[PDB]
Amino acid sequence: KPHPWFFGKIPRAKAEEMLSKQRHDGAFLIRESESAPGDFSLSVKFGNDVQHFKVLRDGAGKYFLWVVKFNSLNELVDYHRSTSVSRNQQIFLRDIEQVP
Ligand SMILES: CNC(=O)C[C@@H](Cc1ccc(OP(=O)(O)O)cc1)C(=O)N[C@@H](CCC(=O)O)C(=O)N[C@@H](CC(N)=O)C(N)=O
Ligand SMILES: [Cl-]
Numbered sequence: 001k002p003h004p005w006f007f008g009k010i011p012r013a014k015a016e017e018m019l020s021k022q023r024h025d026g027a028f029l030i031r032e033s034e035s036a037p038g039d040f041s042l043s044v045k046f047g048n049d050v051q052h053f054k055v056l057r058d059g060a061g062k063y064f065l066w067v068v069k070f071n072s073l074n075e076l077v078d079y080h081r082s083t084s085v086s087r088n089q090q091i092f093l094r095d096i097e098q099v100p
């Protein structure tokens with residue numbers, strides 16, 4: 001039942017270390033930014049690179065990456081599983097392969 005994508009306060013570098021070991025493009029995690037307290041960040045695997053996106057907020061507290069906004073991080077993540085997170089490549093969010 002708990003979400004396998006919330007890693008809390010893990011450094012940007014630790015997110016890259018973790019995702020570099022993932023095999024599939026789109027393997028991701030939501031973390032709580034250290035450089036900007038109170039803000040969330042989306043780290044995604046693509047090739048042997050890891051892309052980082054800042055989870056932006058509107059005036060009402062809704063969450064977005066580019067244009068489409070949501071009431072929760074959960075809804076933002078779910079939308080981005082079928083619509084690309086990147087404007088340069090087709091990267092669709094997929095759950096990480098966890099260590100059992
Ligand atoms: C290497 N550059 C970055 O990590 C900056 C990111 C945004 C970003 C992410 C994290 C961050 O600090 P932290 O939580 O400590 O990691 C600061 C800026 C970016 O521009 N990402 C790209 C997408 C990924 C890539 O092409 O490398 C983008 O165009 N982001 C858009 C959309 C978005 N919501 O981030 C933007 N810059 O507004
Ligand atoms: Cl994997």
Ligand SMILES: [Cl-]
Nearest residue numbers: 055056057058
């Ligand atoms: Cl913001």
Ligand SMILES: [Mg+2]
Nearest residue numbers: 082083084090
């Ligand atoms: Mg798309």
